Symmetry: C5
Subunit: 395 residues, 5 copies
């Protein structure tokens, strides 16, 4: 022999090599690949289309008896790079695929001198999962990635793990944070899927668990909803017989009705109807509608509509009571007949103004009482919302 | 002979193999492929472009007399993996294609020892279908997938099924739910398409039938439309001679006119005009316009416009009737001439106020009667809408 | 000889075959391809980018003297499938390309025993054309598809038709309807393009003619524009001295000014300015502005602004005329000096109210006359619009 | 010899041909390619991303001494088609690339009998350029396309032109018009780029110059801005003591403030701040704000706020002047004490009404004068805008 | 020997060359590649997805002992072009990849006569980085590009620099400006990443540092926020007892509440909550709400609500003080009983008007004082904003 270089090893073990055969001596022995996965980024979550988009780093090794050499008589070389398109590579795919993500190809693999061939590749994957939007900003999502051979059965290709599942689960080394989703764990699980008798497939199932960071939807949702309550609370201080109080309240209701629709496009809702945020917005609207209807009732109650006297059943029910329940406090005959008519024409205007003053007195007491009831209702709703947030926030 | 391995089988039957020929001994015998399909996901439905996007799992087998071996004298091997790019593969396409979906390639096939070669592959397909939007949230869609050989005729390539059509039709095993579309059935149908005499093609036609889940468009459509009726019903309680009732009603009409346009972009409408939802919105607007015109009529009827007396033809037509149809109830001479002028200057103001009070009395009776008629009309429309929904919802 | 199979024919005529040469015996004879096209779908029309996107079915045949065999002594085979990547294929492209559409490849062709090789393929094409938007919902579009060889000249590759042009023009067999565009005809035309002397190219030019279905833009354009006229016609019935009539009219003008802008994004306009729909909207706004200015004029005319008496030049011009043109109908001396001052303080208030009543009488007659003129103008515009639509609709 | 066909020429000169070598006999002689370009379409201009997208037609030829034959003894053939993937092709790229546009490949080239090999190909290119938006609808853009070899130096590959630069510059034969951009010229320029000593590269630089057609942004910008001035000019005719004049002006300011924001998204602005159109809109808003502030000043000046008498310093400054500057014009004693009190209670109401009438008289003269000043200011702005447009429009 | 050409060199050193082996004589010696990078364009920055998109120019060289020749006896050739797909190329990738950018391939490399093979290629790269939006328009971003071999270890492939790091850092020669991001420096850094013992990888880490040009978000943010303060300052000059002052203020608050939401979509916010711009907008709203509440307080204070006399505790607290703190200043008996009643009916109306005048006098002094306080608060906020901008702007 001689020494051209140590490309004569690669000449030795790729001369008569057939990349089509499953590389075993005895065909009864399965090829056992050993995989694991580290998660790199969560690229997209489509809650409408039920489609997850991540990016992982992937590696695998297997053993073949056709890529073996003694490490002596080749100047002590124990591993080398072989191009990927010249050896047998197993078809390990994902069941949950809905599309093909673009990922760089890696043109080389390692091969040790026992036949342990190692493959390293990054791969973008676009999978489909069931996403629960029962509670939109505070939600964990449990997505599956099932690695399986698409053709070969479990007596043909078998799948194990590279390393221990306790350290696959607790691995957050290169995950890109600051990206709306916190990784929690990547839990592997082995299952043998049998489609029927005598055809069973090896599957390795990774459960990724991600939690949404709720800080995004606390300035885009909680701020204008809490904000348009203080405009109501200021707008109750308008006197009801002005006329612009109704125009105030309907303008503010218009301003919030625009807000609900301009929010409801950027917040998805799938297979349930609405989350609890939709219930809290309906309660926020039910407060504002009765805030409007109270002003409509007082403006109806306080007007000049040639109306009758206030009822003494409901005068001492309301003025003497509500200051102690809550609040507190021959020609001379002709001239006589001419003057009596002028006195009568003035006293009826005087009486019709005193009736209006009594109804205006009833209306302000009611507008104070209903304002107290509304203020305590808004306060009791706000403390319920805070004490429901603090149960989540603590631990 | 000897024993290198059992790659010598693959050396035996791929040495002089030609992947260009249609692999039969007698050229008069057609190659019969046997296909079936399980549906995985409905990715998109473009009602505007009439384009469906699904993702299926696909499999097929056929027989070739060039891939046969005796299972003895090869150490009892009965099947093996052969790369896909080294054997003849039929060109089974879809007639309804409009684009190419990205799908992973599967580089291996099984080959049994009789020549039964099996191919498993997933494939994303983007097809075109006719979509009826006659009833937008409650609609089934009947889409076709016609598998056919694009070149070969029925004496050259023939298409059958893998398994029975009764179990292709009732197969929902891996379909991704929670995704706006329920699968109902995938019904296969064989047809021999003859383009003319002496050129006929085999076609296998799958009819997928999907039904939209109507829960999405019942919180984005039914909630604000039913919601802006209660603002009208509250807004009738304003007294009409205030002036802000008209400003209330036109603001609410503005608020719903924004709503119709901001909805009509996210709801498609194709080849029919509108669905029935568009008719129900036009009726919802026809109620609101007459709600506006009633207030315009009462505000015209109740004003101070130096107007004449109320007509006694229509005074006892309206006050004595509508409380029983529906509702219920030398210097002394100079001073005399000076005082009579002051009495005359006051009595005309008194008369012009009593005329205005009589017209204000007519206006409130009309505003009560028209409010009752409007409330019963809205109630009779709502119960018709409920009893049309309950026919769909039951069974 | 013997009988392996009839793959020995494909061994016979693809052994020493060179797929690079233009396959003729005499190099002076041109290769004549024969093409035709059936239209399948109109996928997109971008009026802004001037880009058409269709999907066609395409087929072609040509003759080569290197793929010939006698049908005897091969067990009577007269045609067979040959892979596409092993024979010469002409480069027939489109001049109007701006991009590459994704289309499935067809890996096989037929070859008859005279050398007639037939190719069938579907192809998505994205071309560029000039689109006229002079009349937006009622428009035909005349788009060209010029098939030509990109390199070879007319003494090298020549292009004819498969079948007669009278039956290419009248072919609507597989076109997908219900898709905003009706196909009308696909008219072929042969032209020899000479770029200069001694370099001429064969071109086959298909003119596709498509017509838009105008039903889409008759519920999204004609309905709110005709709708916001009846709100004006109702809003004239408000009495002008109320104060909320101006607030009515400016709110309705705001509501239509939002409508024009929220429509003008989804309706394109290219190289002309606007279509006639833009002129009809400007006339619709010119009616609404004079509807506003009439109310401004009457509200200016009817007010209490310490104004003078109505002019008798224009009192009998307007009250006696317009009911026949159109409408119809020592201490006693001290007390005397005290009372005369009170009479004088009342008679000036009486006079200042009678002046206001006379101006209020003029204002209502003008508000009736201008309402009649506006109603007849709107009616004369609507019948002109109907009689312009009916010329299009008939035949 | 014999005559199979004239594929024996292609057998002769592609038998031992190496497509990897730069095809020259003497390695010191550079390969001179000769290129030119005709512009077909301007597909997109992203002013935000500074990215141009065009579509050109491209051609080039070069000479190689390995593709030569005598035209005799091959039956007088002087040119033939050779596939592109079998000869040496230079790497001519563009420096300004930011992406890869999709373009059809052309699989054949011509080769003459001297070695002149001609290549024709269309190519979509996506380049980056500096875009000036100093004047948005009236702007020319000067974009560069630098053709260069990406690897080879000027003693290895050299670049010249096909034809004369005077006829490359004036070539508008197949450009697609009606597409928002007029082509003006495509000016070529040769530069030898030397990165350092002893490494210089040949570059051929095409300057495309395109001009925007300003007709698009004259109906979407100039029409509502000129339109909302006439609503102001009509709205000055409201009498200021009505109360709805302020509600008119703020509603119109709201309507234009919506307009500015809903325009400012579809008009880009990059590296300068704003164009001059942004300055003209700020002046359009500065007119409308002082139109609002004038009404606020008159409404403050005309009210009933228990105010004092008009100042005689500013009464003859304003009523006697502005009609010549611009505009034009024992018991009897008890009854006496009772009546004197009634006279005193009426004369103070009379005085407080005459004071209000004098302030109302001052307010109308000011509302006429400021309306004249505002009308002349709007007219002087409009004629300045017209005489700045007409300088551009003429020649 | 003879002279065909100098393609016999390429015949000499690519005849028995194996492109799969790592090209060294002694396998213990690592292949040292030498890279550097010049930055060309910043294509996109997604602050939501944390994804950077740039375009660089890249070059590298390495040494191989299999591509060596003596420059004599080949007619003095010292370098030549070899196709890329025929030699060994190292796999230098980026750790921060999330996708594959489209970049043109370069089909040739240089090879010198010592084996120094040089590779030039442009490459679009889409990477992921952490982006801080703590201060949105004034922010630098520190993004990493880690070049590493994806498979080979540091005894197999090693990475150095082409040129000195001081001139890689200060290199801005071909960067495309005018594009929202200024390049500052590209700083290289070498690190040996050891994943565990006996497996270490060579990494070359480039830190690109880019700064946003803040001029874009100073006309789209600072202009309407500073603009809607002057509308408030004008709107305080309305007299509070008019009624349209409240309708002014709530319309302006509506107009700014639309503005905040229509801005907040085009300005991202990630992992922090909000930048300081969000705090400045909340302060801008806190000024406008107290501007509204002041008008509500004065309108409540100034009305006719059958109210009592102004308190003398707070009359000399406010009228005598605030003009020195800030601002400045038998039948005759029957007729007697008839007249005394008329005097009494007038004097109570007189008293109820004088009470309203005293409250109107208090309200205007308060409306002046609060206007001065609000104007000084807005001025003190504006100068704080200017003196915080000028610290950034200086040097
Ligand atoms: C579509 O446009 C083409 C324009 O090229 C029309 O062109 C003419 O077609 C006739 C035959 O139909 C030729 O004889 C003329 O020479 C063509 N004229 C030109 C200027 O090219 C074609 O008729 C149009 N089709 C329709 C339906 O309008
Ligand atoms: C064709 N041209 C030739 C020289 C000018 C630009 C192009 C591209 C190419 N240049 C370059 O590739 C290039 N130049 N410099 C200074 C660099 C620094 C770091 C990385 C690459 C480069 C070769
Ligand atoms: C080489 C060979 O023939 N092996 C076995 C044979 O011993 C038995 C038979 C029964 O199935 O199966 C096979």
């Amino acid at each position: 022999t001689t020494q051209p270089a140590l490309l004569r090893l690669s000449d030795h073990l790729l001369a008569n090599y057939k990349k089509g055969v499953r590389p075993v001596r005895d065909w009864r022995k399965p090829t056992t690949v050993s995989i694991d996965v580290i998660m790199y980024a969560i690229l997209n979550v489509d809650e409408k289309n039920q489609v997850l988009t991540t990016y992982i780093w992937y590696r695998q090794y297997w053993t073949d008896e056709f890529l073996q050499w003694t490490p002596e008589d080749f100047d002590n070389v124990t591993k080398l790079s072989i191009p990927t398109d010249s050896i047998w590579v197993p078809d390990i795919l994902i069941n949950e695929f809905v599309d093909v993500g673009k990922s760089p190809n890696i043109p080389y693999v390692y091969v040790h001198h026992r036949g342990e061939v190692q493959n390293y590749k990054p791969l973008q994957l676009v999978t489909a999962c069931s996403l629960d939007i029962y509670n939109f900003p505070f939600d964990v999502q449990n997505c599956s990635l099932t690695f399986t051979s698409w053709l070969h059965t479990i007596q043909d290709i078998n799948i194990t793990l590279w390393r221990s599942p306790e350290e696959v689960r607790s691995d957050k080394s290169i995950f890109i944070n600051q990206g709306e989703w916190e990784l929690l764990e990547v839990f592997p699980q082995f299952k043998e899927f049998s489609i029927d008798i005598s055809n069973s497939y090896a599957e390795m199932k990774f459960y990724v668990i991600i939690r949404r960071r709720p800080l995004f939807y606390a300035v885009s949702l909680l701020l204008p909803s809490i904000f348009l309550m203080v405009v109501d609370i200021v707008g109750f201080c308008l006197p009801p017989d002005s006329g612009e109080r109704v125009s105030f309240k309907i303008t503010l209701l218009l301003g919030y009705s625009v807000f609900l629709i301009i929010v409801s496009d950027t917040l998805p809702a799938t297979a349930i109807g609405t989350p609890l945020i939709g219930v809290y917005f309906v309660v926020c609207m039910a407060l504002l509608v009765i805030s409007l209807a109270e002003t409509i009732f007082i403006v109806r109650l306080v007007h000049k509509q040639d109306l009758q006297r206030p009822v003494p059943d409901w005068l001492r029910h309301l003025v003497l009571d509500r200051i102690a329940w809550i609040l507190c406090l021959l020609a001379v005959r002709g001239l006589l007949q001419e003057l009596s008519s002028i006195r009568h024409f003035l006293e009826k205007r005087d009486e019709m103004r005193e009736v209006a003053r009594d109804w205006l007195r009833v209306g302000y007491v009611l507008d104070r009482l209903l304002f107290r009831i509304y203020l305590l209702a808004v306060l009791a709703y706000s403390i319920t919302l805070v004490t429901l947030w603090s149960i989540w926030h603590y631990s």
